[PDB]
Structure formats: structure tokens, C-alpha cells
Amino acid sequence: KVFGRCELAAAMKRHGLDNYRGYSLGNWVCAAKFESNFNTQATNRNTDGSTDYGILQINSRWWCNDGRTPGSRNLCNIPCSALLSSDITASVNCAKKIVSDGNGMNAWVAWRNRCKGTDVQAWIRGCRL
Ligand SMILES: [Au+]
Ligand SMILES: [Au+]
Ligand SMILES: [Au+]
Ligand code: NA
């Protein structure tokens, strides 16, 4: 599923991300944009052999089991395949654990480089929420 901007903002808002650990909805939507281009099916291999999965590009090194990332954790207790659903529940619920980690949204390289300290509110303007 490739979500529209306001469509993802609404779905993220429902699943409890709006100002979750202090990050406004616009951060999460900006994060999704630059991580996955709003595509629930997005996969990208990292240089270390791990893979990032789904709309928020959750990494196999720590958070999910994909059965080809040796010596890695599954801190969200899920198959990485669950993160590629058109239903974002699992991605959202695993992102909540990630962002609570104590590094906050800095764990998303695209958020830090492209969203952090920008006008993230632009990512929800004109959306009904
Ligand atoms: Au959720
Ligand atoms: Au994020
Ligand atoms: Au959803
Ligand atoms: Na893993």
C-alpha cells in the first residue's frame, strides 16, 4: 500500500503516534516519507547484512526476525514480514518501543538528516485528523 500524506497522518493519529514521547504527527509522517516514500512494502538491505522493513524501515539488527540476520535481536518479537502489511499497526507498535529506547527518533537516519528541526507541521497541513 502506498499511503497518501493525509491518509498516513490520519492512520498514524488513530494508532497513537501524535505527540507520542513528544514527537508531533508531522515528525512521523516526514519520517515515513523519507524512509519508505509511504510504501508499506519497502525493503532496503544495510551494509552489515541486516534489512530495514516497511513504512518506517524498522531494522532486522534489533527489532524483528527475518531469518537471515545472524547475531541480531527481535526486541519487537515479530517476523520482519509483519512490518510489510497494508495495516501499519505492527510498524506503529514496534516504533513506539524503538522511540522509547532513549535515543528517540534519532534511530531513524532519514528523520535525523531530513526532518529533525525542520517545519515538520507542513507534513499534515490540509489534512482532516
Ligand atoms: Au497501533
Ligand atoms: Au520515527
Ligand atoms: Au492502520
Ligand atoms: Na533480528
UniProtKB/Swiss-Prot annotation:
UniProt EC number: 3.2.1.17
Reaction(s) this enzyme catalyzes, per UniProt: Hydrolysis of (1->4)-beta-linkages between N-acetylmuramic acid and N-acetyl-D-glucosamine residues in a peptidoglycan and between N-acetyl-D-glucosamine residues in chitodextrins
Record-linked Gene3D superfamilies: 1.10.530.10
Protein name: Lysozyme C
Described purpose of this protein according to its UniProt entry: Lysozymes have primarily a bacteriolytic function; those in tissues and body fluids are associated with the monocyte-macrophage system and enhance the activity of immunoagents. Has bacteriolytic activity against M.luteus.
Domain of life: Eukaryota
Protein family membership: Belongs to the glycosyl hydrolase 22 family.
GO biological process: cell wall macromolecule catabolic process; defense response to bacterium; defense response to Gram-negative bacterium; defense response to Gram-positive bacterium; killing of cells of another organism
InterPro entries: Glyco_hydro_22, Glyco_hydro_22_CS, Glyco_hydro_22_lys, Lysozyme-like_dom_sf
Keywords of the record: Allergen, Antimicrobial, Bacteriolytic enzyme, Disulfide bond, Glycosidase, Hydrolase, Secreted, Signal
Gene Ontology molecular functions: beta-N-acetylglucosaminidase activity; identical protein binding; lysozyme activity
Other observations noted: Lysozyme C is capable of both hydrolysis and transglycosylation; it also shows a slight esterase activity. It acts rapidly on both peptide-substituted and unsubstituted peptidoglycan, and slowly on chitin oligosaccharides.
Main location: secreted
SUPFAM superfamilies: Lysozyme-like
Active site: residue positions: E35, D52
Residues engaged in binding substrate: D101
Residue ranges of domain C-type lysozyme in the record: 1-129
PANTHER family xref list: LYSOZYME C
Disulfide bonds: C6-C127, C30-C115, C64-C80, C76-C94
Coiled coil regions in record: none
Cellular component terms per the entry's GO annotation: cytoplasm; endoplasmic reticulum; extracellular space
Tissue expression from the record: In the egg white and polymorphonuclear leukocytes.
Location of the protein in the cell: Secreted
Subunit structure: Monomer.
